[PDB]
Design a protein around this ligand. Structure first.
Ligand SMILES: *[C@@H]1O[C@H](CO)[C@@H](O[C@@H]2O[C@H](CO)[C@@H](O)[C@H](O)[C@H]2NC(C)=O)[C@H](O)[C@H]1NC(C)=O
Ligand SMILES: *[C@@H]1O[C@H](CO)[C@@H](O)[C@H](O)[C@H]1NC(C)=O
Ligand SMILES: *[C@@H]1O[C@H](CO)[C@@H](O)[C@H](O)[C@H]1NC(C)=O
Ligand SMILES: *[C@@H]1O[C@H](CO)[C@@H](O)[C@H](O)[C@H]1NC(C)=O
Ligand code: NA
Ligand code: NA
Ligand code: NA
Length: 1283
């Protein structure tokens, strides 16, 4: 008995079981058919006659939920039979696919993805108009939602920008239909900081015994792609002889090495020789070891026998071919020899054809027992394989062959061929996972049978057909697709039959259905290599085109069904390129034309098509080709250097042509930036030549000095055959001063209602110590507080910001900008877009600090902070105005956490580490923090409404504490909260705050002198604004405006958030409707003129560079608002200093000139009640040419752990973060390597400072063993004073 039914069950589809009775004992067989959570309970007493099959239909009830489903077939009466099958229920009629342009992404880049939705017919579902797609990070935060993502021909396409500092790990693209997951796909985001490199070792030509040698390509690269320089020790082991061949060579990224054998004579046609390569990186001595087995071959080709079927049929023709291939898998053409099969007296002397085949049609007589296929070539090569005859028990097969094409209402014709003379065989045809038709066929003891079937409409547009019989005591089958070509998407993609060449263009040719959507994608196998262990898109898409998917291929599994039979019967057995979508257009074809990227790599090109009617069309296999750059140059530069330092700029050349060529490398002196040591400053370029053999990196370098601070352009051109082949690069080195220059900005504003003339004099000479070189100074006119801010929105501070609080510079300022230019109703679209986009990036970024709590902490993982949770939570709520990507539930969770932290009395205490003493401290009854939390909730209407209880209790607390609030910081916040709340005590609170204010009468300044004067003065200004005290507010603004950092922000984080809010609020209310003024800048002997006449000025520069002068005169005349700024760029000497910190450095003895181990110890100097600092950072600066490795920090003290290590400026600077410091000694050791040759180097330094009060800091200088200029140069450019 043979029982075949579908394996998958649906809500309405008729389930058709087929039972075939080929048993010749009885005349009929009787069967019980149980089909059974307890939702289905259908049974049928069924009769099946001999030499026939029955088809039993089952109506599936509409209300079928998920559960456990079974089918049971029991032989009733005098016939034992028990068979059983698991039946998988399917909820949906549709299937989903996600295509991602890359498997791994880096911090910078964009994820592009497409969501494919096809129904059972493999076409866009008519019902499904849109989908729900959500992307979340490695910790499941929702970063991007598309609630209603429209399908266009079944496809939805979109992208996500990855943040500069994103969550590393596995991200999830999730697709949902009607609130149920249809498809999920992951992708990785990884860091390039994998400074470890990988070594490749492969033969450069395939080794033949006759060569008596092995030629090897050794290749060493970092993951990003840059070549590594080192020394490679190559060993090759001959163990039969106890031999060991050794060679060493310097490898500049890529090298060749020939190892010569002695009397090498293999016992077989093949021998594996083990090779070991130790690659020692240049200065670091980082060693990577790579091993492989290298096969030496006697012949340049191999033969295998490819047979039409594993065994032959005694009287019938037998088709096979001798397949010749080279040892790289490619066809080997023109290989000649003599084939002979003596059993049949067959013989032919011929050569392998263009496909590498020698085709054979042999003819065994029934007599013939086996076929001995001999091949002998004059080179001594021989190949023999025996073919045996078919043995019914193990060898029997049945095959299916389509004899006519397949059309709508026509007969389909098949030749069924079996090894056995058939008394029966069975067919089944299934479409959309159900058996549509089946038959019991009775050949009259015949090996061949012409099967004919009418194509029915339920078979349209795609069906398949299974045939099966019993031979011996095993079930043999075959199958075929039934693809109706007239109803198909006949999609095809092809590439022009030529060498595809980097930089040049190529033409893509494609054909299909006129309307059809086409999705294209190309991946380099380098990106596929590292992670092919996960699910490829092309395998997914190609599978769905066919059927279903460990162990071995089960045809029934894949066809969507199960088989069962008698117990004793067996069954037989680095940017994305060509991410384009297009349409096929009028003629049924399109030709897309594209530029091939300038890179050496191998491509995997893919294309699919979906037609709204004809559905899914796919290409057979992916298109493959390689692009090989003839010639290129790779740079290897330090991130930064300093003026006066002699630096070697090292490059490496690569030649991929067939011969050795002299390369000419030119380094340019761009805008007087570059001195070439040993030649005049007037020279604009320097050219050196070097020979470059094929496939061997050769180094080239230039000894230079930098003339100018800033960005040095590194402009190089290289060529080989009189310029028939060139490469160029445009790169950057940062030239820096000795001391981290600390810019001062003096600013004065004017706000003219009526036509006014005013003359502002400015003295400059408060600007020198012992050495200042020559401080450089610039005047700036700005129409708005936000012009420089908006300009600098991504880089507002000159201080690191890697902590939860600090990280809000990438978020809050964007809100300030947006909600200011909304209040003024600005139409400057570019500006709004910019702040909007960065706000989005900032959300992604802030999420790093969300805790399991639902709270926000100072570090990626730490106890939540009530300050931070109030700060972030409310700030995000505000941000819902401008971006839709904010997770509301996530915000609610944060604010609930915050609300639960409140005390019965209404008071808030700190939680987690104390990084900001003045805010978090509980030395003044918790007024600051309580006031802040209330303030933050008060600023947002939605939060106000949803946490009325917290505000009420909070305001009661303040009301109780008011008489004791003696600290201007606390009072300024409490007052502002009261103003927002309209608390009866607001007028009283503000009067008190005013009473504590200070004055500078000479400058018309009002401010508050606390240890954080910017914050408290800013909070006071908000209250002034809220109380409409505009005239008394200008002296306050006068002061604040003048504490601003060069970018328009304030030098620090909270200073910036409160400060800009306050300035911006005050600005909106005091500045005229229109700006119409003239500014005359008079200095020494000159006069510069500026005119501002628009109000919608904002993206406007009015920079100017005063020279080394003493005085300055600014005459303003007209109407409007403006900022008059002077910027100083001091160049103070680099000197040891300490104020309230102790910092000691010591260099440890490494025993290598190329390694620096710097021991750092810092501690705070406690005084009176001030025992610990705020959050403290250490920055370590390196000498020019040094780089830190992967984990540069060791021997950390444990008392007070480093909470964060950040490596920046190409491993040139290391920032370490602490919650705070006291008198404990916080030490660590930093390891760095000398990576670049630099002479006459300037000293480096280490800093420690209190983040929220940078006046408290220490700085210590250090020097590394000074390299000599005479060691640094190559003999050509070594100057006069050397030798
Ligand atoms: C690439 O596919 C996109 C859809 O992902 C096509 O853009 C759509 O074009 C149709 C025109 O019928 C509009 O109704 C949609 O609004 C467009 N969608 C979006 C979001 O752009 C686009 O035409 C395709 N590209 C080409 C040139 O063939
Ligand atoms: C991706 O999303 C779905 C549902 O959210 C889930 O099945 C799957 O586990 C997720 N993948 C990962 C890596 O968490
Ligand atoms: C092995 O390398 C050397 C140096 O390139 C070359 O001359 C020799 O021909 C190579 N062997 C083969 C068989 O290519
Ligand atoms: C690496 O080895 C070289 C050569 O032996 C030596 O000069 C150098 O000191 C070593 N570097 C380190 C980091 O130990
Ligand atoms: Na806190
Ligand atoms: Na001042
Ligand atoms: Na030096």
């Amino acid at each position: 008995l043979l029982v075949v039914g579908p394996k998958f069950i649906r809500a309405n589809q008729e389930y058709t079981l087929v039972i075939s009775n080929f048993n010749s004992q009885l005349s009929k067989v009787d069967l019980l058919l149980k089909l059974e959570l307890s939702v289905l309970n259908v049974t049928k007493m069924v009769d099946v006659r001999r030499n026939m099959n029955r088809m039993i239909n089952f109506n599936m009830p509409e209300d079928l939920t998920a559960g456990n489903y079974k089918i049971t077939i029991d032989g009733q009466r005098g016939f034992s039979f028990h068979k059983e099958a698991e039946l998988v229920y399917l909820s949906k009629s549709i299937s989903g696919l996600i295509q991602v342009d890359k498997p791994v992404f880096k911090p910078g880049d964009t994820v592009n993805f497409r969501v494919i939705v096809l129904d059972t017919e493999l076409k866009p579902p008519a019902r499904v108009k849109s989908v729900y797609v959500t992307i979340r990070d490695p910790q499941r935060n929702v970063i991007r939602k598309w609630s209603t993502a429209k399908l266009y021909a079944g496809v939805f396409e979109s992208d996500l920008q990855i943040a500069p500092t994103p969550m590393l790990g596995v991200w999830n693209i999730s697709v949902e239909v009607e609130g149920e997951e249809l498809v999920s796909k992951t992708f990785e985001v990884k860091e390039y900081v994998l400074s470890t490199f990988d070594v490749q070792v492969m033969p450069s030509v395939i080794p033949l015994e006759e060569h008596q040698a092995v030629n090897l390509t050794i290749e060493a690269n970092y993951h990003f792609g840059k070549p590594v320089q080192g020394v490679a020790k190559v060993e090759l082991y001959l163990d039969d002889d106890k031999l060991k061949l050794k060679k060493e060579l310097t490898v500049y990224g890529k090298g060749q090495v020939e190892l010569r054998f002695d009397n090498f004579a293999m016992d077989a046609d093949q021998q594996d020789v083990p090779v070991k390569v130790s690659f020692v990186e240049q200065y670091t001595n980082r060693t990577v070891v790579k091993q492989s087995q290298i096969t030496v071959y006697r012949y340049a080709y191999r033969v295998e026998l490819i047979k039409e079927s594993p065994q032959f049929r005694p009287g019938l023709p037998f088709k096979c071919a001798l397949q010749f291939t080279h040892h790289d898998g490619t066809p080997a053409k023109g290989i000649s020899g003599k084939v002979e099969v003596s059993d049949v007296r067959f013989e032919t002397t011929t050569t392998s054809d263009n496909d590498g085949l020698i085709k054979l049609e042999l003819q065994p007589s029934e007599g013939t027992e086996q076929l001995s296929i001999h091949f002998n070539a004059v080179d001594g090569f021989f190949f023999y394989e025996d073919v045996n005859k078919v043995e019914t028990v193990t060898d029997a097969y049945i095959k299916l062959e389509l004899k006519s094409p397949i059309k709508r209402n026509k007969l389909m014709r098949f030749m069924v061929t079996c090894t056995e003379r058939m008394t029966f065989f069975v067919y089944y045809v299934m479409s959309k996972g159900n058996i549509i038709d089946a038959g019991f066929m009775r050949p009259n003891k015949q090996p061949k049978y012409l099967l004919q079937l009418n194509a029915t409409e339920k078979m349209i547009p795609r069906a398949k057909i299974l045939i099966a019989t019993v031979a011996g005591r095993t079930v043999v089958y075959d199958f075929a697709d039934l693809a109706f070509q007239e109803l198909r998407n006949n999609f095809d993609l092809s590439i022009d039959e030529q060498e595809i060449k980097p930089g040049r263009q190529i033409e893509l040719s494609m054909s299909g259905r006129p309307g059809a959507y086409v999705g294209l994608a190309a991946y380099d196998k380098a990106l596929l290599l590292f992670n092919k262990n996960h699910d490829l898109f092309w395998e997914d898409i190609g599978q769905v085109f066919d059927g279903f998917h460990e162990n071995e291929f089960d045809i029934f599994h894949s066809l969507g069904l199960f088989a069962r039979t008698l117990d004793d019967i067996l069954f037989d057995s680095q940017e994305s390129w060509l991410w384009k979508n297009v349409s096929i257009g009028r003629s049924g074809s399109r030709k897309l034309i594209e530029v091939v990227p300038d890179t050496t790599t191998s491509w995997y090109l893919t294309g699919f098509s979906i037609d709204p009617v004809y559905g899914l069309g796919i290409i057979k296999k992916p298109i493959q080709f390689t692009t090989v750059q003839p010639f290129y140059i790779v740079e290897n530069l330090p991130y930064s250097i300093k003026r006066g330092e002699a630096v070697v700029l090292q490059f490496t050349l690569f030649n991929n042509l067939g011969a050795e060529y002299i390369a000419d490398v030119t380094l340019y002196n761009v805008a007087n930036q570059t001195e070439f040591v040993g030649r005049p400053n007037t020279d604009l370029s320097y050219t050196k030549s070097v020979s470059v053999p094929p496939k061997v990196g050769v180094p080239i370098s230039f000894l230079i000095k930098a003339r100018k601070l800033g960005e040095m352009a590194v402009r190089v051109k290289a060529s080989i055959m009189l310029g028939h082949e060139t490469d160029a690069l445009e790169k950057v080195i940062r030239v820096m001063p000795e001391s981290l220059v600390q810019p001062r900005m003096d600013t004065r504003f004017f706000c003219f209602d009526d036509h006014k003339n005013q003359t502002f004099p400015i003295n400059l000479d408060i600007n020198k110590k012992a050495d200042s070189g020559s401080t450089k100074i610039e005047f700036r006119l700005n129409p708005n507080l936000l012009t420089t801010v908006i300009k600098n929105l991504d880089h507002l501070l000159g201080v690191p910001t890697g902590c939860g609080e600090q990280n809000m510079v990438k978020f809050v300022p964007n809100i300030l900008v947006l909600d200011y230019l909304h209040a003024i109703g600005s139409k400057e679209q570019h500006l709004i877009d910019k702040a909007t986009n960065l706000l989005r990036q900032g959300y992604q970024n802030q999420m790093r600090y969300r805790q399991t709590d639902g709270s926000f902490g100072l570090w990626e993982t730490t106890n939540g902070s009530v300050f931070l949770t109030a700060f972030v939570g409310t700030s995000m709520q505000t941000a819902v105005k401008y971006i839709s990507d904010i997770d509301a539930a996530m915000v609610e969770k944060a604010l609930d956490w915050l609300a639960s932290k409140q005390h019965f009395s209404g008071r808030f205490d700190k939680a987690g580490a104390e990084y900001h003493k003045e805010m978090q401290g509980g030395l003044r009854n918790g007024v600051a923090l309580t006031s802040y939390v209330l303030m933050a909730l008060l600023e947002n209407d939605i939060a106000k409404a949803k946490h009325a209880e917290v505000i009420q209790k909070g305001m009661t607390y303040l009301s109780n504490q008011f008489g004791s609030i003696n600290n201007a910081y606390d009072l300024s916040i409490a007052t502002y909260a009261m103003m927002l709340n309209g608390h009866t005590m607001k007028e009283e609170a503000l009067n008190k705050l005013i009473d504590m204010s200070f004055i500078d009468a000479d400058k018309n300044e009002r401010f508050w002198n606390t240890t954080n004067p910017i914050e408290t003065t800013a909070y006071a200004l908000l209250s002034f604004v809220m109380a409409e005290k505009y005239t008394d507010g200008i002296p306050v603004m006068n002061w604040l405006v003048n504490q601003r950092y060069v970018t328009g922000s304030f030098p620090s984080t909270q200073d910036t958030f409160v400060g800009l809010k306050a300035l911006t609020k005050m600005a909106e209310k005091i500045s005229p409707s229109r700006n119409d003024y003239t500014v005359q800048l008079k200095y020494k002997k000159s006069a510069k003129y500026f005119k501002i006449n628009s109000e919608q000025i904002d993206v406007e520069n009015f920079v100017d560079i005063p020279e080394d002068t003493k005085k300055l005169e600014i005459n303003v005349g007209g109407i409007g608002f403006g900022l008059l700024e002077v910027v100083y760029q001091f160049n103070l000497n680099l000197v040891n200093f300490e104020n309230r910190f102790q910092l000691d450095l010591e260099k440890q003895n490494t025993g290598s000139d190329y390694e620096l181990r710097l021991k750092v110890c810092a501690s705070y100097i406690p005084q009176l009640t001030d025992r610990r600092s705020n959050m403290a950072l250490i920055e370590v600066t390196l000498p020019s040419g040094y780089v830190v490795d992967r984990n540069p920090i060791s021997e950390q003290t444990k008392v007070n752990p480093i909470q964060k290590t950040e490596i920046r400026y190409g491993g040139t600077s290391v920032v370490l973060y602490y919650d705070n410091m006291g008198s404990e000694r916080n030490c660590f050791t930093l390891t760095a390597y000398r990576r670049f040759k630099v002479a006459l180097k300037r000293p480096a330094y280490v800093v420690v400072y209190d983040y929220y009060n940078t006046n408290l800091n220490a700085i210590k200088v250090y020097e590394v063993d000074k390299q000599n200029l005479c060691e640094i140069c190559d003999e050509e450019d070594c100057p006069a004073e050397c030798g």
